[PDB]
Design a protein around this ligand. Structure first.
Ligand SMILES: *CC(=O)N1CC[C@@]2(CCN(S(=O)(=O)c3ccc(Br)c(F)c3)C2)C1
Ligand SMILES: *CC(=O)N1CC[C@@]2(CCN(S(=O)(=O)c3ccc(Br)c(F)c3)C2)C1
Ligand SMILES: [Cl-]
Ligand SMILES: [Cl-]
Ligand SMILES: [Mg+2]
Ligand SMILES: [Mg+2]
Ligand SMILES: [Mg+2]
Ligand SMILES: [Mg+2]
Ligand SMILES: [Mg+2]
Lengths: 9, 227, 236, 9
């Protein structure tokens, strides 16, 4: 997988 | 046409565009709102962020599909990958342009300063994802410098469980891992961020609890992936 | 840029790439370029053309419906302040939707309908003409509305007449046409009786010949038949 | 609740 970055809140 | 619309109307139309899932429109409305020259509130910064994140997000997804097909491999896939890439770079340049010309200032609260510097880091990171030249090195340095300045402010001015501080730290850790080939720094930053946040979680206001716990979960998910 | 000078094969390939990237506006632009090379489209290429524009107009229709709902809720609340912004933005989205519809109808008229040889391709394009007039009808309000509805009906009817003469009752395109014409009757022309009668007849005649239907079209045709049934349940 | 038209194959 790719790393997760900050999502839309 | 945006110049002639009132600021209040541009904000309203951005909210309408969000509801219609028209993110390109939403971004254009928020760009117009920024160009009115007044500061953005927390809520308005969210609108700006969501709009451009969704636009560049679609382009990044498309670029990855095309780049994958290209690497498995006529000129067509290369040409079309280049076309999508150029559009993605255009959106990044627009955002970085807004940050530089209007949004990033010496003044105003730490939260807004950190938010905009984080965003500068993010859009240089997206440029870095597709960069290949000597421009790549420069782009990476620009991302790092933006993130580092944001980190320095957040450490001095913001609690460890603050959502923006956390979101910044998450994205900087991703930069370390995915862009700068620094897994040790990525893991160490993520681990330290998580522990320090959890240690102060009992002091965090309830209005930030959901956002902060989400970021902390992503720190944990990344840590599991990286180790 | 400049698709006129591009190889047809390259435009088709780029449409397929765009599909994989979920870049439907690009996909539609590539297929428009391919049509403008002036050769007929195969079944596969007609699918690419259809998927591209359907996804583009589909997103616009969804957005229009959201905005129209907000607009009417605002208006009926009758508050002294709110309403102008949502109206203006609904109008903007509507104008873009009409532009895509006009582009498709333009292609059908200038390149695709006249030049089609076989019945299958003729029915497909006449169905598509019906569909994009129907999408125009969804947002039309003037006396232009009546004319738009008549254009949709006329396209669908011509397609129906050909499909009945030239195509088996289980043919996917014939079925898809019949489904969409029944939707036109119900949702656009305020003719629920005709909608139900067409859908019911289509379903029964398809089911009666289902044992003859080839395995290659079985999935598509049974899906349409299920939608006929779902609509019938909704309408009765 | 809207009627169903033909989907993408
Ligand atoms: C108050 C303010 O300026 N805000 C609140 C929301 C946002 C928009 C994007 N972020 S973020 O990137 O810092 C972030 C994203 C997701 C999550 Br769950 C989070 F906690 C922060 C700040 C603008
Ligand atoms: C052979 C040919 O010209 N085709 C096959 C597929 C298509 C594009 C979509 N249709 S349709 O609109 O007639 C249709 C859509 C969905 C389904 Br399940 C169906 F059976 C037909 C014709 C172009
Ligand atoms: Cl291209
Ligand atoms: Cl507007
Ligand atoms: Mg003004
Ligand atoms: Mg390039
Ligand atoms: Mg050629
Ligand atoms: Mg009121
Ligand atoms: Mg109108």
């Amino acid at each position: 997988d790719r790393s997760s970055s900050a999502p839309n809140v | 046409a945006m110049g002639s619309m009132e600021r209040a109307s541009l904000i309203q139309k951005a909210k309408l565009a969000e509801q219609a899932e028209r993110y390109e429109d939403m971004a254009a409305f928020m760009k117009g709102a920024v160009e009115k020259g007044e500061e953005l509130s927390c809520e308005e910064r969210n609108l700006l962020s969501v709009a451009y994140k969704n636009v560049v997000g679609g382009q990044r997804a498309a670029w990855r599909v095309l780049s994958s097909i290209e690497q498995k491999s006529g000129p067509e896939v290369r040409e079309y990958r280049e076309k999508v890439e150029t559009e993605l770079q255009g959106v990044c340049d627009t955002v970085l342009g807004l940050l530089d010309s209007h949004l990033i200032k010496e003044a105003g609260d730490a939260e807004s300063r950190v938010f905009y510097l984080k965003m500068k880091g993010d859009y240089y990171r997206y440029l870095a994802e597709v960069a290949t030249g000597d421009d790549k090195k420069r782009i990476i340095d620009s991302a790092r410098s933006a993130y580092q300045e944001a980190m320095d402010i957040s450490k001095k001015e913001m609690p460890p469980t603050n959502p923006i501080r956390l979101g910044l730290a998450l994205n900087f850790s991703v930069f370390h891992y995915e862009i700068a080939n620094s897994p040790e720094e990525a893991i160490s930053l993520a681990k330290t961020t998580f522990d320090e946040a959890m240690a102060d979680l009992h002091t965090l206001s309830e209005d930030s609890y959901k956002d902060s716990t989400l970021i902390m979960q992503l720190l944990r998910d990344n840590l599991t992936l990286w180790t």
